[PDB]
């Protein structure tokens, strides 16, 4: 997250950290959508271009965390993965269309002040909140700055970062990329005009794009960070997987394996 701020304690209790077992490296972000289900971006698990092809054992999850370094005893929770589900029509060869994935935890996780699932949108909320201009919130541990030059070492956040980004108009961003933006995705980010800066970076992929419904005060996951570009050499807006648009699939998977 570029130009964000430190997340307050328990500000994003659905925040999940995807890890590689060995070597233990933080890979992506993800979100808790129930005691046993975790939502993330498919290309975080499967992306041949970056030699990524992970199986349930290669990965490990960490929930409740707030500091990337310090171990938070009796606050954070580790969890192994039972099964990985990558959307069948996930197109990584072209535009990362349907860049979504579900991961069933081996054992359910206990909720607390630091761990709580986020709601998935329903037709009324998606139609009501998913509009241009409206702002959503993105969170994650990706770099604090540019990562297109050399070295990966610098720029790593010590504590969970957070930033609010406005939803971009479909045509406005289709014109910002030579990439085919499908209906299963939406863009978000400030136009260089607007003073307010802030953006998601690659290391934030799979993390949640949430919005707080003013109708019932509940936080909803409208998207998944599919392609943040705050840390790239260029990139006008970020690409997100339209969650509601793929809910039918999300339910099918859940309503069958747990």
């Amino acid at each position: 997250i570029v130009e964000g701020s430190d997340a307050e304690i328990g500000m994003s209790p659905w925040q999940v950290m995807l890890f590689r077992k060995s070597p233990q490296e933080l890979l992506c972000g993800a979100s808790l959508i129930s005691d046993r289900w975790v939502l993330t971006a498919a290309h975080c698990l499967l992306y041949p271009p970056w030699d990524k092809n992970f199986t349930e054992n290669d990965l490990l999850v960490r929930i409740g965390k707030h500091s990337r370094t310090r171990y938070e005893r009796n606050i954070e929770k580790i969890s192994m993965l039972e099964k990985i589900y990558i959307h069948p029509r996930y197109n990584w060869r072209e535009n990362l269309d349907r860049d979504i994935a579900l991961m069933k935890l081996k054992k359910p996780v206990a909720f607390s002040d630091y761990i709580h699932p986020v709601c998935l949108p329903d037709r009324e909320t998606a139609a009501s909140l998913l509009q241009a201009g409206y702002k959503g919130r993105v969170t994650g541990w990706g770099n604090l700055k540019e990562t297109w030059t050399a070295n990966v070492g610098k720029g790593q956040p010590s504590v969970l970062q957070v930033v609010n980004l406005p939803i971009v108009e479909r045509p406005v961003c289709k014109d910002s990329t030579r990439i085919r933006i499908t209906d299963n995705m939406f863009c978000a980010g400030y136009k260089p005009d607007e003073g307010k800066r802030g953006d998601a970076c690659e290391g934030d992929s799979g993390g949640p794009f949430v919005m707080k419904s003013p109708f019932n005060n509940r936080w909803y996951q409208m998207g998944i960070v599919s392609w943040g570009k705050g840390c790239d050499r260029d990139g006008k807006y970020g690409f997100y997987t339209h969650v509601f648009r793929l809910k039918k699939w999300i339910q099918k998977v859940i309503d069958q394996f747990g």
């Binding site: 307050e8 328990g10 201009g133 919005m211």
Partner: protein, 31 residues
């Protein structure tokens, strides 16, 4: 399970407290 209570943060919505920037989200709804 957890859906019945999804989207409600223990240290915020449950304690009737707001976070430092959620206000900014609400305001974006009002052009």
């Amino acid at each position: 399970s957890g859906e019945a209570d999804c989207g409600l943060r223990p240290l915020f919505e449950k304690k009737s407290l707001e976070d430092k920037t959620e206000r900014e989200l609400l305001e974006s709804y009002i052009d």
